[PDB]
Amino acid sequence: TGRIQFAVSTPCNTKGKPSGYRLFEFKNDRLALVPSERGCTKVDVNANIQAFCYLRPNGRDTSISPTHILDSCDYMVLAKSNGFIEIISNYQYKIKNGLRLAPSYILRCTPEDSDYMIAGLEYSQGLLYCCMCSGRIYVFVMNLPTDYIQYKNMYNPMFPDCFFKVHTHSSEEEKLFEGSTRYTGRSCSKHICYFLLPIEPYQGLPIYRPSMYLHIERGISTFHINPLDRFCFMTVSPRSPLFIRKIILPLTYVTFLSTFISLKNSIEILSWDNVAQQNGFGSLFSWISNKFINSTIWDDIVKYSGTGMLDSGIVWKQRRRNTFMVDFEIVEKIKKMDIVCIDHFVTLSAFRPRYYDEPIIKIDSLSNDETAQFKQALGNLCSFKKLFMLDDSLCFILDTHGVLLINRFEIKNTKNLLRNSKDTIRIIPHDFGLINDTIVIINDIDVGTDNVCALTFHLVVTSMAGEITVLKGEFFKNCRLGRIKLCDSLKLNRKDRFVDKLALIDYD
Amino acid sequence: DEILNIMSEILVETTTDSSSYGNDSNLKLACLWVLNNLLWNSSVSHYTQYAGDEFVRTPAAKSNVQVTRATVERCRKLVEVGLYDLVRKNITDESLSVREKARTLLYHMDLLLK
Amino acid sequence: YLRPRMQFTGYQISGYKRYQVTVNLKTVDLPKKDCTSLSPHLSGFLSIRGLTNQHPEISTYFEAYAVNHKELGFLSSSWKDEPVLNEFKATDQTDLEHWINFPSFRQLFLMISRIFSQEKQFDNYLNERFIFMKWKEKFLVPDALLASYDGFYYIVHDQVTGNIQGFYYHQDAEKFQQLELVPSLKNKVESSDCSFEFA
């Protein structure tokens, strides 16, 4: 079918031991550990890989080797547990040629208080969001072309338009923001960290500060970026409603950023204090005040050396039995967005935020000869774990006791599932056993009339037992059940190491 | 042959036939555990599921054909003796533990027979 | 799945961090139609170790009482006033919240005084698929002499798949910390049985 390259995070438990990641290969019908020399074993001591994010061009292919105005490189950013983010360029070339996977750029979350937990690390339209479960968000502005996208843990042989990825209401601040912060072009000192400001003094690599910082008084567990609006994000905490919030941009920060970008383009600058002393000013802020507003925002900017303190505003909130919402995703229905959420005690919900606050679709208590097997399979579901969207309608949920395909439009009878059609709900019974992550790769898709699909797929599941398992499965047409089988498995024989979440690198 | 007869006399006991042994669920559970141990091993698990060094393969993922046909012959002998109907009658048993254990054993034997 | 030598593995979400939880049973003594004795129904060792951080392992000896709808009801008002049973009692409202969180509780009661009156006509609790119970850590397992376990666990156990879910309750602590255990698979499908009996 084709080789699969991915990376699995392995954190340790005992103190004074490295916690890192390992690159794995699924080739032919075998799993293999790729021998690779990662970074030095002192950075990973008491700091485990908390998040992965892979940046690559959408339409154009990646570069082969490290004089082009249009960038075509490949990026991996790693989020640690001590507030350090590592950016490594040319990931696949270094993996194939067996080079050293040393970080190229270092990012720091500077307005802080080695026990920081990453609620999320995502990228959208030149903005990198890193949010902490205490409820604090750091925003970095990157110098990337528009066609770069984040590679998710999902492959689909056809590419639907149900996600707002392939491309009036903006205010003046947004217009000057997108005008002043544009992709310049790949040259000397024109790397990805161009619009960032360094800490004035990880070997000799310069460390950079975030562009924006936010703190909300709720604490978040899951976090997503709005694909429609760049400065909009939505968060979920346990036993709390869904929140959709918007960045409020003052004119002072936009003017400061535009003037700073013009000043930098006028002139590697590692310390702006040395340049200010050479220019007879003593500080960059005196220089930009001479070259030039709100007093408090400017004082906040000059106090934290470039980072701007911002305040958010809630634009949507959903409306006793508590909710333990595990996952959600934003889907275009083919502001025309829907939000689909899976909740731990087997519950599925769908909201339309423009028209209603209450859920427009709600399937609750899903567990409450072929029909006997279907009833037995539904009775064994315990707790929903993972959600994917194949299309604008299909929902691919992974429980700990099976796999569900649910068509949320053709359901017409809540609390009595036997009166619905044959292909609206399909179940594969399999004891997964307290998963951590998964990589869905759709090998063979076939859609047919009245929108009924049959597919063959692959699964990459890590568990609390310490096992990495690759499985093959198939959902048929006009059949209420399915079929799964195990292709390969590897067991981690360590009493301290764990097998944490994993990120997909490549699939042929 | 005497142990299989003892197992068949233990499993046939019910609410109305609690004379020879007393319909005790512990003896039924022990007999089902013997029948489970006779039909379960690593090669059968690999055949019916699949299609230091810090990362080792599981024993069920790693000669197996001879062990598999020996286990299938054991299953056919158990069917010919007549314990399959007793396993069904223990699907229709009062206690829950014997019900679930007999259901798992019957599903495994059904999947081995085909 | 509640045999004497049985191991369970899972996690626990405390605050926002995740921990790995292991449970090894020691003695299982589940009563029947008449029970006016306060001997513990379940007993074992519960060990919590860090998964996100480098927190050291804390392992404790715990005991547990099941919920049969004759003497030990769902609400902590039918439980008798005894010095050994007074650590499992919080409030009828708190009990109702922590039990209504589970879907099997609702499916039981759809088939304060009203729920007890409906509880009085239930069937045998050992013939039902789901078993509700409470867990309480007693002391430390390696050396008792050589206390962050002042709360107790609301536990639901499913017999067919044999898995354990629950919540941890303490008044001066965070609320609704999940457990979500699963049986630990062995490395040999053939199993042999040992036994013991208190004289």
PDB file of C-alpha atoms in Angstrom, chain B residues 13-87:
ATOM      1  CA  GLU B  13     -26.628 -29.926  36.426  1.00  0.00           C
ATOM      2  CA  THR B  14     -29.332 -27.263  36.577  1.00  0.00           C
ATOM      3  CA  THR B  15     -31.924 -25.837  38.984  1.00  0.00           C
ATOM      4  CA  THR B  16     -34.058 -28.999  38.758  1.00  0.00           C
ATOM      5  CA  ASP B  17     -31.117 -31.423  38.366  1.00  0.00           C
ATOM      6  CA  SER B  18     -29.181 -30.324  41.485  1.00  0.00           C
ATOM      7  CA  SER B  19     -28.835 -33.825  42.907  1.00  0.00           C
ATOM      8  CA  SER B  20     -25.522 -35.318  41.774  1.00  0.00           C
ATOM      9  CA  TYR B  21     -23.400 -32.255  42.577  1.00  0.00           C
ATOM     10  CA  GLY B  22     -25.775 -29.514  43.743  1.00  0.00           C
ATOM     11  CA  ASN B  23     -25.615 -26.956  40.870  1.00  0.00           C
ATOM     12  CA  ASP B  24     -22.515 -25.333  42.358  1.00  0.00           C
ATOM     13  CA  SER B  25     -21.133 -22.589  40.124  1.00  0.00           C
ATOM     14  CA  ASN B  26     -17.519 -23.076  41.261  1.00  0.00           C
ATOM     15  CA  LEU B  27     -17.300 -26.564  39.740  1.00  0.00           C
ATOM     16  CA  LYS B  28     -18.870 -25.264  36.518  1.00  0.00           C
ATOM     17  CA  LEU B  29     -16.337 -22.417  36.416  1.00  0.00           C
ATOM     18  CA  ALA B  30     -13.469 -24.870  36.958  1.00  0.00           C
ATOM     19  CA  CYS B  31     -14.736 -27.114  34.141  1.00  0.00           C
ATOM     20  CA  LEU B  32     -15.096 -24.136  31.789  1.00  0.00           C
ATOM     21  CA  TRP B  33     -11.565 -23.073  32.743  1.00  0.00           C
ATOM     22  CA  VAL B  34     -10.245 -26.539  31.816  1.00  0.00           C
ATOM     23  CA  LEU B  35     -12.077 -26.347  28.482  1.00  0.00           C
ATOM     24  CA  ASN B  36     -10.626 -22.868  27.929  1.00  0.00           C
ATOM     25  CA  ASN B  37      -7.079 -24.026  28.712  1.00  0.00           C
ATOM     26  CA  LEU B  38      -7.383 -26.958  26.304  1.00  0.00           C
ATOM     27  CA  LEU B  39      -8.143 -24.649  23.357  1.00  0.00           C
ATOM     28  CA  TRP B  40      -6.065 -21.491  23.955  1.00  0.00           C
ATOM     29  CA  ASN B  41      -2.421 -20.874  23.037  1.00  0.00           C
ATOM     30  CA  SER B  42      -0.262 -18.355  21.189  1.00  0.00           C
ATOM     31  CA  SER B  43      -0.419 -19.846  17.679  1.00  0.00           C
ATOM     32  CA  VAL B  44      -4.231 -19.951  17.723  1.00  0.00           C
ATOM     33  CA  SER B  45      -4.267 -16.322  18.902  1.00  0.00           C
ATOM     34  CA  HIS B  46      -1.972 -15.258  16.050  1.00  0.00           C
ATOM     35  CA  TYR B  47      -4.030 -17.198  13.497  1.00  0.00           C
ATOM     36  CA  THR B  48      -7.398 -15.884  14.705  1.00  0.00           C
ATOM     37  CA  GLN B  49      -6.334 -12.261  15.313  1.00  0.00           C
ATOM     38  CA  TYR B  50      -3.626 -11.292  12.824  1.00  0.00           C
ATOM     39  CA  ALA B  51      -3.950 -11.086   9.048  1.00  0.00           C
ATOM     40  CA  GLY B  52      17.250  -5.025  26.443  1.00  0.00           C
ATOM     41  CA  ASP B  53      16.068  -3.547  23.149  1.00  0.00           C
ATOM     42  CA  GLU B  54      13.357  -1.053  24.349  1.00  0.00           C
ATOM     43  CA  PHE B  55      10.924  -2.237  21.639  1.00  0.00           C
ATOM     44  CA  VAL B  56      10.093  -5.938  21.318  1.00  0.00           C
ATOM     45  CA  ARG B  57       7.383  -7.739  19.393  1.00  0.00           C
ATOM     46  CA  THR B  58       4.442  -9.317  21.179  1.00  0.00           C
ATOM     47  CA  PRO B  59       4.293 -13.139  21.406  1.00  0.00           C
ATOM     48  CA  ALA B  60       1.013 -13.042  19.452  1.00  0.00           C
ATOM     49  CA  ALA B  61       2.671 -11.246  16.510  1.00  0.00           C
ATOM     50  CA  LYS B  62       5.661 -13.559  15.973  1.00  0.00           C
ATOM     51  CA  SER B  63       5.415 -24.115  13.025  1.00  0.00           C
ATOM     52  CA  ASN B  64       2.094 -22.513  13.938  1.00  0.00           C
ATOM     53  CA  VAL B  65       0.124 -24.536  11.370  1.00  0.00           C
ATOM     54  CA  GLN B  66       0.722 -27.891  13.106  1.00  0.00           C
ATOM     55  CA  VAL B  67      -0.284 -26.438  16.479  1.00  0.00           C
ATOM     56  CA  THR B  68      -3.350 -24.874  14.849  1.00  0.00           C
ATOM     57  CA  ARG B  69      -4.540 -28.140  13.296  1.00  0.00           C
ATOM     58  CA  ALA B  70      -3.878 -29.954  16.585  1.00  0.00           C
ATOM     59  CA  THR B  71      -6.078 -27.412  18.384  1.00  0.00           C
ATOM     60  CA  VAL B  72      -8.763 -27.742  15.692  1.00  0.00           C
ATOM     61  CA  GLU B  73      -8.669 -31.536  16.108  1.00  0.00           C
ATOM     62  CA  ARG B  74      -9.072 -31.050  19.870  1.00  0.00           C
ATOM     63  CA  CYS B  75     -12.081 -28.803  19.202  1.00  0.00           C
ATOM     64  CA  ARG B  76     -13.601 -31.429  16.893  1.00  0.00           C
ATOM     65  CA  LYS B  77     -13.096 -34.106  19.559  1.00  0.00           C
ATOM     66  CA  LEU B  78     -14.791 -31.853  22.130  1.00  0.00           C
ATOM     67  CA  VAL B  79     -17.698 -31.334  19.713  1.00  0.00           C
ATOM     68  CA  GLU B  80     -17.981 -35.090  19.088  1.00  0.00           C
ATOM     69  CA  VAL B  81     -17.988 -35.849  22.829  1.00  0.00           C
ATOM     70  CA  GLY B  82     -20.961 -33.546  23.357  1.00  0.00           C
ATOM     71  CA  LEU B  83     -19.827 -30.624  25.502  1.00  0.00           C
ATOM     72  CA  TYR B  84     -21.007 -28.035  22.944  1.00  0.00           C
ATOM     73  CA  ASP B  85     -24.682 -28.452  23.859  1.00  0.00           C
ATOM     74  CA  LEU B  86     -23.716 -28.267  27.537  1.00  0.00           C
ATOM     75  CA  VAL B  87     -21.939 -24.973  26.818  1.00  0.00           C
TER      76      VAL B  87
END
